[PDB]
Write a protein that binds this ligand. Structure first.
Ligand code: HEM
Ligand SMILES: O=C(CCc1ccccc1)Cn1cncn1
Length: 214
């Protein structure tokens, strides 16, 4: 559809279904996640968000990203550092895994941010709006399954404290995505990058599932 927000949703409809069907996702939705499995995901998300939010800061002024620049409402790096310190302890940054599928995702993020900053919106869309939509649902599953201590730590990633209403912000973010000035050629590449982003997520959760058994 003419609006980029609708165009991205239509284009990634099929790959989103693939993600829903993914083995780890099937297991998680039924509360079959272990602490090691959950730690593995938190570690992955950290690496992904470090790369993404590094590239966002590099391209925050540029007309190709500036309209969708919402650091205070969306940034997840700081929250993930807080959570990993709980999950992996004081030595978290030394001991956290960095696997091929994490590397490939991080690699693509840096490639986009450095050489194709016009497509960064596709990765920011895929990460932020996805994580915002499922944040509280995924948290509630994690709370039930993982049986945490009363330490008040470990799940900061799943709350966006500067977004009171997810629907309110998502409507604003979509409008800002639609406000982006781009040529027909760039627009098509943005669409393709969104599918690539979804596929990098699918490839990641497939790898994580493979690593968990055993
Ligand atoms: C168990 C797997 C998953 C389920 C059940 C699921 C389900 C959902 C649901 C119910 C929504 C809210 C619908 C809406 O109002 O837009 C949503 C949003 C979204 N999800 Fe997922 N999802 C899954 C995995 C993923 C993955 C791996 C990604 C890739 C990063 C992803 C990306 C997104 C995006 C970008 C949105 C926002 C769509 C929009 O509003 O334009 N999802 N998802
Ligand atoms: O799936 C999402 C983040 C990946 C993840 C999966 C399981 C546990 C923690 C984190 C966000 N999302 C996208 N659509 C709905 N939710």
């Amino acid at each position: 559809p003419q609006d980029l927000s609708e165009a991205l949703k239509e284009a990634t409809k099929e790959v989103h279904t693939q993600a829903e069907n993914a083995e780890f996702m099937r297991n998680f939705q039924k509360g079959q996640v272990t602490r090691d499995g959950f730690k593995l995901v938190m570690a992955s998300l950290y690496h992904i968000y470090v790369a993404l939010e590094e590239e966002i800061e590099r391209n925050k002024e540029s007309p190709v990203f500036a309209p969708v620049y919402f650091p205070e409402e969306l940034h997840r790096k700081a929250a993930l550092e807080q959570d990993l310190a709980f999950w992996y302890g004081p030595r978290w940054q030394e001991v956290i895994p960095y696997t091929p599928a994490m590397q490939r995702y991080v690699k693509r993020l840096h490639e986009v941010g450095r050489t194709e900053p016009e497509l960064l919106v596709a990765h920011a869309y895929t990460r932020y709006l996805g994580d915002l939509s499922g944040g509280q649902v995924l948290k509630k599953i994690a709370q039930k399954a993982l049986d945490l201590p009363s330490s008040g730590e470990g799940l900061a990633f799943f709350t966006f404290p500067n977004i009171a209403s997810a629907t309110k912000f998502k409507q604003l973010y979509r409008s800002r995505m639609n406000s982006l000035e781009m040529t027909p050629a760039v627009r098509q590449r943005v669409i393709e990058e969104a599918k690539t982003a979804f596929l990098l997520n699918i490839q990641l959760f497939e790898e994580l599932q493979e690593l968990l058994t055993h």
